[PDB]
Design a protein around this ligand. Structure first.
Ligand SMILES: [Zn+2]
Lengths: 335, 577
């Protein structure tokens, strides 16, 4: 069963071959394909020896103007993943309920305890209510809920990765302001997300045909007159038989970047890469231990980790800063 | 029928020869009669219970410890009736005031692998089981008639000495007086009673098959097992899985576990000295404040202050009964960058009593109960923390009413709600460690403000590169707590005459310029000194000089505390303008 997976992982170039296996229909977005693939397998939930409880869950937050297949990105991840659940934001915690059969006032499970090990697909993130907002943040940095309800005082477990998509205000994302303005979300919540992908639109002529032809053809072969087999068994296998290790040769390969970029960002109207970004980068370090079975930290996927952790930060920036920081780093990082 | 009592009179004789003969220890050292001695030493103290161990019973007579696993109901009786005939030939002659022999509740423990609630299949009905869990509830103790006596109503015929069966099963009063149909009533004057509780046991968290809410079971404690465990404990129950007999489906019964063995999972003269010498050593101050925040580094003042809140000042009662505070409050202003949640978790973990809150609320509420249809009172966190410490984050998220009430609670140190049908008072005695992200008055309810700051020089960036791996990689608390537990309770510090004239001249000159500060600029908001802040200074110096078991504080720490405060007030000075 593995004997194939051995050489298939030893291709040394499984990255490209797996990226275009998720998002099977939707054309383009090989950018966000990368991030979501990073999220799917996950990372490594190491337990720090200083009693600090770092988490091993990658949470994503899409955003972009209406009509760009965000919801489809949610629905396909409903299928490909395992033990997944789903919800809209327009039930998040366990609540007292009168049983249909037994006629006793029991307690029923919510929507963040049914993903206690898998994924939680939130939709219409903006439409959440104040109680829902004050309840969602607790589970991010603690991953554990208490219920002192009418039923009884309990404290249960919730270890889920959150995959949600918000909307742009004014019916269109406009990149003059920062992303923290068009999202319409409380500020300490966006920090609880690792990746911040920003979806947009395009009127380029040569891609109009490329996308049209694809949709039209997908409407030609659906009506009554890496495939979906390798990667499902692969997310089952590669979830289990790896335990990525952590050496200390990369420990100084990054600080040389931070010392520069912190000044580069603070110089202008922005807050540089902070520790809650280094944590995301170091989490996505192992995100490729699951694809390659590599499990050893190398100066190769650190070029990838830093690249991604800046990819999800240059976009959420100002008008001329999203390009000034590019002219500096996108040419500096030697992409 | 006639062989029944003839077997029993031969079991109650082999259960008696076990207590009377079982020894331990080898032949080289010397022996020890294990259960006679405990019977005597527990009777003479007035306890009346032994703790028989099942391995011993097995190793002495192998058949008995099997019956006890199969028919525990009708054999525990013989065991507890032999424990009473052995405790008679051991303690007698009882001296003067007691000459009636009591009854010995024989508990029993074991060393065997535990089952789990999900493994209680109905073939285990009336077999000793052994399950772990967590207590989740506790009823109030009640009476339970054991030896009851009835009387007729019309002809006044008595039929006494009737014995109830143990567990949750009643009794069927006759109807054939030998007078109307059921002429029998209970005589309340003649009925021996024993206590009984009723707990509720939830299954351990790491054994739920993870799709649902954990299942729980119901217990039934007895005479000496009552008031032995508190909701929140870990236990290991040895009970007789059985059924209620108070006589969805046609033949369904209820089920409980009659507990007859209980366990719990987890100061010294020589330990006192490691507190003594540590309080006496010259650099006693920094040694603690260094080992109270290993992960987070930078600006030990925000860790210097937290050292005092763990000790606190002292509670004084003037002649007027006008008591004084004995706790402190702290505010850590600044952006939420998750650097502070770690600190909250630490201070909560290393505290004698402590709760970290983001349910019912913080202060008390008045809620319309579904059952009563009326309003009831819900004391929140600050009434459960007795002397402990409460940690709070996002000081603008808490409910408007709740924030008002926490303001008043830090003001007066008690919560008194006068609403629909509720007029009570709850003493709030805890410590507030708040983290911010605001009136000049809720701000002034505290005494110490710490806001966050940083730089960006490339040597500063070398400090940052240092701090990178200090987190990339990832005096003990286990004795720090047991040190505080003895330090708080043995020191009575007050101020010495010189600290008085130090503080007077510091505070007067702190006031003396606020005038010319606010008379000209008056930027619609500022923060001046108040006597509440002065009292805060005094109760800080007390907590400093309590680190050293030093019953009299001096100028040794007043000036550094005043400079700490020159930091903590200038912070809010910069923030409020
Ligand atoms: Zn009669």
């Amino acid at each position: 069963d593995v004997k194939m997976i051995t050489s298939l992982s030893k291709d040394q170039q499984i990255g490209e071959k797996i990226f275009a296996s998720i998002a099977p229909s939707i054309y383009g977005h090989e950018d966000i394909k990368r991030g979501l693939a990073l999220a799917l397998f996950g990372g490594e939930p190491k337990n720090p020896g200083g009693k600090h409880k770092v988490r091993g869950d990658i949470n994503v937050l899409l955003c972009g103007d209406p009509g760009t297949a965000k919801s489809q990105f949610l629905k396909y991840i409903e299928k490909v993943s395992s033990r997944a659940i789903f919800t809209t934001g327009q039930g998040l915690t366990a609540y007292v309920q009168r049983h249909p059969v037994s006629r006793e006032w029991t307690l029923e499970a919510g929507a963040l305890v049914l993903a206690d090990r898998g994924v939680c697909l939130i939709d219409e993130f903006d439409k959440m209510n104040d109680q829902d907002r004050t309840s969602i943040h607790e589970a991010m940095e603690q991953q554990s809920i208490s219920i002192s309800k009418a039923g009884i005082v309990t404290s249960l477990q919730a270890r889920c990765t959150v995959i949600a998509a918000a909307n742009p205000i004014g019916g269109r994302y406009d990149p003059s302001l920062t992303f923290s303005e068009n999202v319409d979300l409380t500020e300490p919540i966006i920090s609880r997300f690792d990746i911040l992908c920003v979806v947009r639109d395009t009127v380029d002529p040569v891609q109009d045909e490329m996308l049209a032809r694809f949709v039209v053809g997908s409407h030609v072969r659906h009506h009554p007159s890496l495939p979906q087999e390798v990667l499902k068994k692969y997310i089952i296998y590669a979830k289990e038989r790896v335990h990525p290790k952590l050496n200390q040769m990369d420990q100084d390969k990054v600080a040389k970047m931070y010392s520069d970029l912190r000044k580069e960002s603070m110089a202008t109207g922005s807050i540089p890469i902070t520790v809650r970004h280094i944590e995301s980068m170091i989490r996505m370090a192992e995100a490729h231990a699951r694809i390659h079975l590599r499990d050893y930290v190398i100066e190769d996927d650190v070029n990838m980790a830093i690249r991604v952790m800046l990819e999800s930060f240059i976009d959420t920036q100002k008008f001329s800063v999203m390009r000034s920081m590019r002219k500096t780093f996108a040419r500096y990082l030697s992409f | 029928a006639d062989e029944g009592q003839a077997r029993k009179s031969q079991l109650q004789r082999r259960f008696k020869e076990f207590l009377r003969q079982y020894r331990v220890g080898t032949d080289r050292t010397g022996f020890t009669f294990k259960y006679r001695d405990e019977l005597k030493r527990h009777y003479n103290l007035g306890e009346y219970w032994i703790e028989v161990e099942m391995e011993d019973l097995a190793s002495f007579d192998e058949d008995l410890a099997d019956y006890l696993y199969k028919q525990p109901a009708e054999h525990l009786q013989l065991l507890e009736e032999a424990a009473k005939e052995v405790a008679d030939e051991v303690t007698r002659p009882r001296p003067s005031g007691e000459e009636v022999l009591q009854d010995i509740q024989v508990m029993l423990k074991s060393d065997a692998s535990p089952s789990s609630i999900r493994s209680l299949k109905s073939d285990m009905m009336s077999h000793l089981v052994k399950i772990p869990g967590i207590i989740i509830a506790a009823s109030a103790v009640r009476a339970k008639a054991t030896r009851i006596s009835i009387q007729c109503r019309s002809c006044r015929n008595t039929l006494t000495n009737i014995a109830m069966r143990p567990g949750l099963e009643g009794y069927a009063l006759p109807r054939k007086c030998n007078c109307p149909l059921d002429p029998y009533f209970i005589m309340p004057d003649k009925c021996k009673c024993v206590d009984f509780q009723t707990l509720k046991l939830q299954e351990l968290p790491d054994a739920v098959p993870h799709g649902e809410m954990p299942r729980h079971m119901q217990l039934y404690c007895d005479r000496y097992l009552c008031d032995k465990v508190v909701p929140g404990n870990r236990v290991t129950i040895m009970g007789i899985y059985s059924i209620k007999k108070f006589g969805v489906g046609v033949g369904i019964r209820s089920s409980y576990i009659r507990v007859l063995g209980i366990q719990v999972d987890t100061v010294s003269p020589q330990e006192e000295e490691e507190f003594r010498r540590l309080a006496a050593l010259p650099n006693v101050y920094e040694v603690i404040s260094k080992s109270i925040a290993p992960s987070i580094f930078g600006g030990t003042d925000m860790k210097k202050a937290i050292a005092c809140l763990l000790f606190g000042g002292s509670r004084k009662r003037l002649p007027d009964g006008l008591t004084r505070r004995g706790d402190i409050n702290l505010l850590m202003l600044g952006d939420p960058g998750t650097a502070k949640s770690q600190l909250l978790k630490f201070v909560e973990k290393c505290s004698p009593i402590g709760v970290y809150t983001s349910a019912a609320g913080l202060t008390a509420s008045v809620m319309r109960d579904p059952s009563s249809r009326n309003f009831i009172m819900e004391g929140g966190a600050m009434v459960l923390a007795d002397g402990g410490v409460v940690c709070i984050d996002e000081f603008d998220k808490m409910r408007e009413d709740d924030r008002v009430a926490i303001h008043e609670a830090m003001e007066q140190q008690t919560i008194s709600i006068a609403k629909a049908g509720i007029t009570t008072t709850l003493n709030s005695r805890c410590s507030v460690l708040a983290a911010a992200n605001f009136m000049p008055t809720i701000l002034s309810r505290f005494d110490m403000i710490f806001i966050v700051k940083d730089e960006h020089n490339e040597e500063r960036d070398v400090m940052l590169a240092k701090h990178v791996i200090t987190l990339h990689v990832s005096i003990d608390l286990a004795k720090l707590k047991k040190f505080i537990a003895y330090c708080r309770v043995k020191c009575g510090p007050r101020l010495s005459a010189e600290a008085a004239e130090k503080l007077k001249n510091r505070y007067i000159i702190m006031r003396s310029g606020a005038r010319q500060h606010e008379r000209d600029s008056d930027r619609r908001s500022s923060i001046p000194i108040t006597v509440r802040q002065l009292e805060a200074i005094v109760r800080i110096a007390e907590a400093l000089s309590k680190m050293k078991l030093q019953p009299f504080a001096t100028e040794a720490d007043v000036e550094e505390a005043l400079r700490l405060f020159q930091v903590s007030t200038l912070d809010a000075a910069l923030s409020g303008t």
